[PDB]
């Protein structure tokens, strides 16, 4: 493990930590600026929307105009966006800073993936994708915890800290990583449309919907939980950080132990259905929580439900495609970004209609996922019994 790989993973960890910094601070911005649920729904989803919009063009620029320069520009833009979020004191400024941060994320992530594909050997096209998901999920979980733990001192400390970390990452990128200066005299004219012309789309429908449902639930849960507990149980941001961080840690430590053991007894599809059923059962109980520690431990028992789903969908993508690790990774990343968009926007819009409406929406989405798995059960049975 050389310093190049460590820096490349740090560049992803910081960027996906930048998404979750906003959430624990909402016990303030809802009352300081007089904003409603839809305002937060747009404010948090802006980062994901900008990243999803700019990822294609960012990757194109990284391919055509070098990879180190694009990464360095993205780190500079990320630092500037974090600082402008910190200094500003209006909805418009924070909106623009979220947009710029999403742009920086969507222009750095393809660069880092390409540089890792360059450095890593040819036979490790699957393990690198596993590291991608591991780092992304770790950042997505540890975002809110650090954000809240820094928000205790002041409203602007977490974003100054994020900007400082971005500057440090940019310095490390300048001083450490390197890419070749020369280029091929004559390439190939294929332009790679062949994969898109040799794809069975029906076999890819189920993993796409499964990962979209997982991403929507996981992203909307944090946004809903922050506001719901700040209203009903009026948590300080410290309590929100404790809940999110503890739930994420428990989910990670149970996933790194029990997943393979569960797989030796259960198929991926049935296990996914059972995990969705467990999650919806826990979310039903979430409505009736009326005290401190019950709704505190609800998050602890929720995060494991999705940490038992994400690796299952990753392995499903790895297995059902074949040798096309790159295409599976691309689809998984794109739909994870789409879920991280569609989650908070709805979880904020429905909050104004009623306090518990987004809980019903999450329950309905989990039910839709589990019934989709049950429908695919008939298809897999038909495939199984028609050949043996």
């Amino acid at each position, epitope marked *: 493990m050389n310093k190049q790989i460590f820096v490349l993973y740090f560049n992803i960890f910081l960027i996906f930590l930048g998404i979750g910094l906003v959430i624990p601070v909402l016990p303030v911005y809802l009352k300081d600026l007089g904003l409603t649920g839809s305002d937060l729904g747009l404010l948090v989803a802006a980062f994901a929307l900008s990243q999803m919009i700019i990822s294609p063009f960012g990757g194109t620029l990284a391919d055509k105009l070098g990879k180190k320069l694009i990464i360095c520009i993205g780190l500079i833009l990320f630092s500037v966006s974090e600082f402008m979020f910190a200094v500003g004191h209006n909805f418009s400024v924070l909106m623009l800073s979220r947009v710029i941060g999403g742009m920086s994320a969507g222009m750095v992530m393809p660069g880092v993936t390409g540089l890792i594909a360059d450095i890593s*050997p*040819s036979h490790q096209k699957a393990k690198n994708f596993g590291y991608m998901s591991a780092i992304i999920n770790s950042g997505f979980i540890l975002g809110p915890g650090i954000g809240g733990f820094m928000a205790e001192v002041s409203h602007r400390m977490p974003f100054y800290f994020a900007g400082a970390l971005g500057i440090l990452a940019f310095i490390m990128s300048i001083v450490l990583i390197h890419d070749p200066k020369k280029s091929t005299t004559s390439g190939f004219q*294929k332009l790679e449309p*062949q994969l898109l012309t040799k794809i069975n789309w029906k076999v890819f429908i189920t993993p796409v919907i499964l990962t979209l449902v997982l991403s929507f639930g996981l992203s909307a849960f944090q946004t809903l939980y922050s506001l719901y507990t700040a209203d009903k149980v009026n948590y300080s941001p410290k309590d929100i950080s404790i809940a999110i961080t503890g739930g994420g840690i428990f989910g990670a430590l149970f996933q790194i132990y029990f997943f393979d053991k569960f797989m030796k007894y259960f198929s991926e599809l049935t296990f996914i259905a059972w995990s969705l059923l467990y999650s919806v059962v826990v979310l039903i109980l979430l409505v009736f929580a009326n005290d401190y520690w019950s709704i505190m431990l609800i998050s602890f028992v929720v995060f494991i439900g999705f940490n038992m789903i994400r690796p299952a969908i990753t392995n499903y993508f790895s297995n059902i495609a074949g040798e096309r690790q*790159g*295409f599976a990774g*691309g689809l998984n990343s794109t739909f994870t970004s789409m879920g991280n968009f569609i989650g908070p926007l709805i979880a904020g819009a429905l909050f104004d209609v009623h306090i518990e409406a987004p809980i019903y929406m999450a329950i309905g989405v989990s039910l839709a996922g589990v019934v989709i798995v049950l429908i695919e059960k008939q298809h897999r049975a038909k495939l199984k019994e028609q050949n043996m």
Partner: antibody, heavy 128, light 105 residues
């Protein structure tokens, strides 16, 4: 146009050692992989060794696995292959070739260029 | 990965269609290339990916893929085309070459 110059080969006592060199000229070495193949007198081809400069990975054929060794010096863009043991079967004409190894970004995913030996340097000959 | 090319030898006249088959005991996706080797000269690439077309090769040399079968087709056999062809597998780290097909005129 580019071309790789190959040097080495000659009369060799069985069980001996030898070093064959392939020097690049005019093309990128970091974004390419150097592959050594052989041709027996009056017979077919078979890929012998493979090295990638950027990734650093090396591989050898199952017919001759772990006996010979390969290396690539990026300072002057050269590839070296070392024989440590020889036999009567090893006599052949060896060729040095290059396959491009670089990713290209389709929107929302990278893809790898296909494996295809573009340029072949003039092969040397090794006997006994 | 075992690879078999047929026929071992083939005789054809000028302008006659020539078909060469290459089959693998294991799936190799579409990473099969086709090379041409002159007598006493370095092999020169003919077709890089399955059914593709390299730069400088005449269009009369074509490739096709059907499951395990990889087929090379030549519509017309100019006397300059007398050489030895090869099918190469490069799907994985290991690389294998076909037996060869020296064409008689």
């Amino acid at each position: 146009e580019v071309q790789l110059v190959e040097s080495g080969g000659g009369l060799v006592q069985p069980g001996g050692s030898l070093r064959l060199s392939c020097a690049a000229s005019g093309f990128t070495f970091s974004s390419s992989s150097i592959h050594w193949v052989r041709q027996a007198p009056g017979k077919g081809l078979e890929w012998v060794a493979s090295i990638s400069s950027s990734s650093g990975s090396t591989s050898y054929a199952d017919s001759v696995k772990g006996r010979f060794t390969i290396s690539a010096d990026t300072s002057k863009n050269t590839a070296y292959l070392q024989m440590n043991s020889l036999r009567a079967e090893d006599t052949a004409v060896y060729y040095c070739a290059r396959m491009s190894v670089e990713n290209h970004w389709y929107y929302f995913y990278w893809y790898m260029s296909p494996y295809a030996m573009d340029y072949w340097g003039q092969g040397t000959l090794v006997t006994v | 990965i075992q690879m078999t090319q047929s026929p071992s030898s083939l005789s054809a006249s000028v302008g006659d269609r020539v078909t060469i088959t290459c089959r693998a005991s294991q799936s190799v996706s579409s990473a099969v290339a086709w090379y041409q080797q002159k007598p006493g000269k370095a092999p020169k690439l003919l077709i890089y990916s399955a059914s593709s077309l390299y730069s400088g090769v005449p269009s009369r040399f074509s490739g096709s893929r059907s499951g395990t079968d990889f087929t090379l087709t030549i519509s017309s056999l100019q006397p300059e085309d007398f050489a030895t062809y090869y099918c190469q597998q490069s799907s994985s780290s290991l690389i294998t070459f076909g037996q060869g097909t020296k064409v008689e005129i």
